[PDB]
């Protein structure tokens, strides 16, 4: 077999959207509040994350099918998946040598050290860093990566989804494009799809873990005041 | 006549509090989101202002008498007067030569040019800049300045004040300490008190003007998202 027009189209659509929402130069980082190497790295990281949410939203809008859902479902999907999509897209800048998120320069190289001073314990960072590596290893293709993100985001099983049938349809089409791609255009990728979907499962664990920690943070004004409106809104639990 | 113990005390209390809440080095500015010389100067200035609100709050807590009011009245007083107290304390860094707010370096020198790109029209900036100069000219003493701020903040005529009698008492004591000071320890200051109180009146006009403009801004998400939780909260109209 081989990918069809509609399928290649979907890939081009996604990959191009990813490009249009992922600045490989990391030039925008200078605009965030300076990283300070007691939650010293919270302001910068809060800005980095808020920035990421913005890109995630723009990426979504460009997923064929996402645009036609009810704002309620788009929001439902966003709020629920945002954090994971961010952990996913963040791997594209994760290094194995120094085991960190290198983003342009040394002042934007986040080591396990820095990442701590952001208000998050290792109960989160540990599984996250493991996810980052297990994923890095898969040495995916831009299309398998861009697809995995789209799939993840179009998961109907998120608290809030109304039309968990149309959202179910879209994702299945996406799941295929991937499954197919890994088949036709991906040599030595016989056990990949499995591992990839498996990653979506790891993300859920990380999602849950972050939610608890974040909830703990948001209840402390001296900290919540350090966040951004966008972050407070998306990560906040307002039905 | 001459100032009394209780009066000098109040001054020492205020002046020391001002010192403990006004960093003459402006070292904290490097922590704000970088100034970018379409509301380009909003992120930085929003951080500068949020930072200022924090100091204003700490200054307040140190005003003898403020600490014993009901949180509701303290909040009422803060939300209502904050903006003015900020415009007041900001003069302490206003220059006549370059007609700007110089704060440490050239990257923190806010010219009438910059100040525009913060989302505010000249209908505000104009009166503000005029206030800044008319005030600068008074060449006040640290004690007349620190006092004017305390007085301003302890104005009972603010929408929300419950006990507008105790707050009335405190301010009158403050109004005197000043009136007295300008008398005893201030040569050539015969028409000062009058002019000073007159300034409190100009502030009201600026307060009103800013409120309208800010209200306009806060209704635009693409802009409100640029603000800080603290600013949204204090400048926001939630009863």
């Amino acid at each position: 077999h081989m990918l069809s027009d509609e399928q290649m189209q979907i890939i081009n659509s996604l990959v191009e959207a990813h490009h249009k929402t992922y600045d490989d130069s990391y030039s925008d980082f200078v605009r965030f509040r300076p990283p300070v190497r007691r939650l010293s790295m919270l302001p910068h990281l809060a800005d980095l994350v808020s920035y990421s949410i913005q890109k995630v939203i723009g990426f979504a809008k460009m997923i064929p099918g996402f645009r036609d859902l009810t704002a309620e479902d788009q929001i439902a999907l966003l709020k629920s998946s945002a954090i994971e999509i961010i952990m996913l897209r963040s791997n594209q800048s994760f290094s194995l040598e120094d085991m960190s998120w290198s983003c342009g320069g040394p002042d934007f190289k986040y080591c396990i050290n820095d990442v701590t001073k952001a208000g998050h314990t290792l109960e989160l960072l540990e599984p996250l860093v493991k996810f980052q590596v297990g994923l890095k290893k898969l040495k995916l293709h831009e299309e398998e990566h861009v697809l995995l993100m789209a799939i993840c985001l179009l998961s109907p099983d998120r608290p809030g989804v109304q039309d968990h049938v149309r959202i179910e349809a879209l994702q299945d089409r996406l799941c295929d494009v991937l499954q197919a791609y890994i088949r036709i255009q991906h040599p030595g990728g016989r056990l990949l799809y499995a591992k990839m979907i498996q990653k979506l499962a790891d993300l859920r664990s990380l999602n849950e873990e972050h939610s608890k920690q974040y909830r703990s943070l948001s209840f402390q004004p001296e900290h919540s005041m350090q966040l951004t409106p966008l972050v407070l809104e998306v990560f906040g639990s307002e039905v | 006549h001459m100032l009394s113990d209780e009066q000098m005390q109040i001054i020492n209390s205020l002046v020391e509090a001002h010192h403990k809440t006004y960093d003459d080095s402006y070292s904290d500015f490097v922590r704000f989101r970088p100034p970018v010389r379409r509301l380009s100067m909003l992120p930085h200035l929003a951080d500068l202002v949020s930072y200022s609100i924090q100091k204003v709050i700490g200054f307040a807590k140190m005003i003898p008498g403020f600490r014993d009011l009901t949180a509701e009245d303290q909040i009422a007083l803060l939300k209502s007067s904050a903006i003015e107290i900020i415009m007041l304390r900001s003069n302490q860094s206003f220059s006549l030569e370059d007609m700007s707010w110089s704060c440490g370096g050239p990257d923190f020198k806010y010219c009438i040019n910059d100040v525009t790109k913060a989302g505010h029209t000249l209908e505000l900036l104009e009166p503000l800049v005029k206030f800044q100069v008319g005030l600068k000219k008074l060449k006040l003493h640290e004690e007349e300045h620190v006092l004017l701020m305390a007085i301003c903040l302890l104005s009972p005529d603010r929408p929300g004040v419950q006990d507008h009698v105790r707050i009335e008492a405190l301010q009158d004591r403050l109004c005197d300490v000043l009136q007295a000071y300008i008398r005893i320890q201030h040569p050539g200051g015969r028409l000062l008190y009058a002019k000073m109180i007159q300034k409190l009146a100009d502030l009201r006009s600026l307060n009103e003007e800013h409120s309208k403009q800010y209200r306009s801004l806060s209704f635009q998400p693409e802009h409100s998202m640029q603000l800080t939780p603290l600013v949204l909260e204090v400048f926001g109209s939630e009863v």
Binding site: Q74, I75, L78, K79, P229 | P221, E222, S224
Partner: peptide, 11 residues
Amino acid sequence: RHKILHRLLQE
């Protein structure tokens, strides 16, 4: 709610 998300999500 979700003032921001809405704006960002609209064309």
